[PDB]
């Protein structure tokens, strides 16, 4: 059971990281435009 909770926390962290990077890339393309 603790393994499932740790995996869920890792997945949430990775998803937040991916969203952050996507927003950064969007700002980069806006800057290039």
């Amino acid at each position: 059971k603790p393994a499932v909770d740790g995996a869920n926390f890792i997945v949430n962290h990775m998803r937040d990281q991916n969203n952050y990077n996507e927003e950064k890339d969007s700002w980069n393309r806006v800057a290039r435009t």
Binding site: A7, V11, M14
Partner: peptide, 20 residues
């Protein structure tokens, strides 16, 4: 369903790493 959601999240992490 939390364990299944965690397994699907690990699959999502693998897919993310492949795309990266």
């Amino acid at each position: 369903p939390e364990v299944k959601s965690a397994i699907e999240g690990i699959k999502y992490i693998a897919e993310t790493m492949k795309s990266d």
